[PDB]
Symmetry: D2
Subunit: 240 residues, 4 copies
């Protein structure tokens, strides 16, 4: 009826396996450069982290069926309940709606966190969809991301202390931490800089978790252990 | 090494058929409501359309391998050259990078087009990826979208003239145009409102095309016929 | 190096979600006609059913990682252990190796079951692959197929008794059983034909299950209830 | 209605890109062992090759929309016309129907080609589906397979001559042909065994092509050059 309509036949199905956890993970694109251009504090910047969380909250409020979100550094993951049928579970739908809504928010609420530092340009975001077949796999995924947060924060805190406090060159710091263990990094922070790693802000150490409590509220607790899951059984126990 | 790492095994491949045209199409999410809340002019609003185009330009500048974009109303399509290997041609990568970069820009440059009308909230965008196997199919796709622009603008121009000038109720206008042909709509515009449809702004009639000429420049020309393609052979004749 | 080799780029990935149950189900193609042309006994034919089972055994013996198979009427399903990496879990590999090996066997061993009735032509088989994310879903799948066996055998036994013993026309039998319940079908079998449905051969009532006990042995037991699974825990409890 | 029916939700879509060539390629599984056990003549065996072709003919006759088939050694490829909608273009359907029908035939017609040599066991077949976006890619695929035929036959003919006529050990033959060029292999065949490679049976040199002329007829002509395609334009020029 448009003799051009036939081009619709080319659209492919990208349905996520039914009754499975659907996760959309976002990553700030070239945020290493973005951070430099906007003078992000090292090793951690409250403005940046909280802005990310604000965006994640917006995504959870504007979209449907997201039961939990976890973010750290330049990433954020959104877990959609496994019984969802939001867009016939079309992978592309999950991806673009989360990526777009997050990006628009990032710019929209920028001023609420960077009152002075001006936004030099509209940033991009890397996104992906992953389907986890069980509760244990989803948990192991979140644990994987939280553990990543811990590993990187421990490394970056010592790293920047060696540079910003000891005056080592980036290259010197690196060689210095080469082959070091978790306990060593902790030892260096305590001896060289009188820093007790365990007293660092929870947000920097554990990242941020968002769950419905109704609005999506921030928590910087451990999600690797069972405690968290035993306290919020509504998330993993939902139907389907 | 995190005993949680196994969760990466769940990531699925979403590679686009090699040596084929890859198109990412975006649609403003619930833009019918967005338009109302931001007092978009009917049947066409220069601010809205130009803002879209500005975002499309940003996407073409920040991403890689896009050789042509076409936009109209609340949509924009981006055509990546078929020999691209940007992200191993992972569909999700095309989608999220285009959707996010577009959305962030939409908010970022909003003021350059809506100097007075304030942005009430960060909008979302619907996205999708389609693979077209040949030059002819890609052309028919673009033609399909431009033809859609024509059909909708002709209808909307009469429709809103009947409401805004003749004072018919939305429902009256609709029944009035029910079963009408292209030639009739044109006749009504000419007799009832002394409007020559063919003299309406090119942008509203044909939409907008972006190609590299180096920066991405706007053109409101016809792309259904051969003229355009004969004049810009670099686009479809590129290797692979 | 063949300047034609590039065509390999077109091959797409079809990997089954990792650590999930992979099932290949086969259906005799146009076996309604095949059955007629080979004078299959109604409602059940021992030769046909046992031949199917023999083929299923061959598939389990020649391929790798199949832990259980279930067959009935003209179908057979093969369950590959979830930790398998046989062909990098490529769906096409599971499909074609099962479908081909089964078909070749169907013809090869035909004489061992149809000593007199000659094979009129080499038949085809319909195949598919399905991924079940959990032990419960796999069980429900097998239950679904066994329950189907029960529903169809109960219906077919009465149906053919009404035709073959009472002399009703296929159409008369159908209208007669229209809207009948399980208990009714059982009542008719008992009153009209002095048939105790529960005494029919186990194979016709429950179908056939193949598991390793080493060779794949036939069992016509119930697999919907827990008994079976409690007795053969090795199947569902295997690693990954 | 079976409270088990929900398991159907797990079935995934595997539709082949519309208006594209769909190819199903089969490979005899472990046919190196099969060949030995059935005393296949080296370097070529007419019985084996013709049996394969017979099977391919059966596949083309029993299935729908196959416009061309090409086989050599232990493989056979089936090209389905690009406008086909046979099974909604479900990849699995193409695969299993071709693989099963081929395998059953292989056993069924075995005696018509191996009147004496008995079939020791029902063989299996490896299968796969590939979608080629254009006429040139499909041609390059067929060329790729025919060229493979040439390369292997030239190599195997010298190779087995060196063993069967010169008495070299398999390992000696190999080292002897190591680093040799096409012209060299030809030279050795002519000087050492008074063999004119170009006079070898066409079937062994070019393989076999099947096209509709109505029944599917065998041809051992070149399909790399344009001659073949100019003479049978009906194949590549068909609609869609």
């Amino acid at each position: 009826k448009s003799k051009f309509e036939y081009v619709r036949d080319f659209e492919a199905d990208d349905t996520c396996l039914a009754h499975c956890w659907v996760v959309v993970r976002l990553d700030g694109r070239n945020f290493h450069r973005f951070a430099e251009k906007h003078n992000f504090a090292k090793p951690n910047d409250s403005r940046a982290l909280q802005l990310m969380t604000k965006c994640a909250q917006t995504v959870m409020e504007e979209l449907e069926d997201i039961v939990i979100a976890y973010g750290q550094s330049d990433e954020y993951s959104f877990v959609f309940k496994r019984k969802t049928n939001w867009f016939k579970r079309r992978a592309s739908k999950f991806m673009t709606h989360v990526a777009s809504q997050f990006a628009s928010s990032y710019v929209f609420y920028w001023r609420d966190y960077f009152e002075d530092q001006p936004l030099l340009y509209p940033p991009g975001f890397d996104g992906r969809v992953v389907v986890y077949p069980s509760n244990q796999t989803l948990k192991d995924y979140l644990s994987w991301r939280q553990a990543d947060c811990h590993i990187n924060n421990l490394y970056n805190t010592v790293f920047w202390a060696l540079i910003q406090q000891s005056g080592l060159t980036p290259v010197q710091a690196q060689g210095r931490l080469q082959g070091t263990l978790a306990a060593d990094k902790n030892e260096i922070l305590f001896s060289e800089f009188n820093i007790n790693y365990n007293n660092e802000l929870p947000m920097y150490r554990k990242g941020t978790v968002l769950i419905w409590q109704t609005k999506p509220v921030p928590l910087h607790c451990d999600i690797i252990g069972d405690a968290f899951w035993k306290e919020h059984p509504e998330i993993l126990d939902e139907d389907s």
